[PDB]
């Protein structure tokens, strides 16, 4: 698994 931690970049599922 490799989910983002705190939307540190454009690779997280919580920055939309």
Q: Could you tell me if 13 and 3 are in contact, meaning their C-beta atoms sit under 8 angstroms apart?
A: yes
Q: By what technique were these coordinates determined?
A: NMR
Ramachandran sector of residue 9 (left: φ over 0; alpha: ψ -120 to 50; beta: rest): beta
How many CB atoms lie under 10 A from the CB of residue 12? 13
Q: Taken in order 5, 8, 15, 3, is the CA torsion positive or negative?
A: negative
Q: Which of 1, 3, 2 is nearest to 15 (CA)?
A: 3
Listing DSSP states for the chain in one string gives ----SS--SSS-TT--
Chain discontinuities in the chain, listed by preceding residue (C to N exceeding 2.5 Å): none
In terms of Cβ atoms closer than 10 Å to its own Cβ (0-12, 13-18, 19+), residue 6 is exposed
Q: Would you state the structure tokens that stand for residue 14, as one six-digit string?
A: 């919580």
């Amino acid at each position: 698994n490799d989910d983002c931690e705190l939307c540190v970049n454009v690779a997280c599922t919580g920055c939309l």
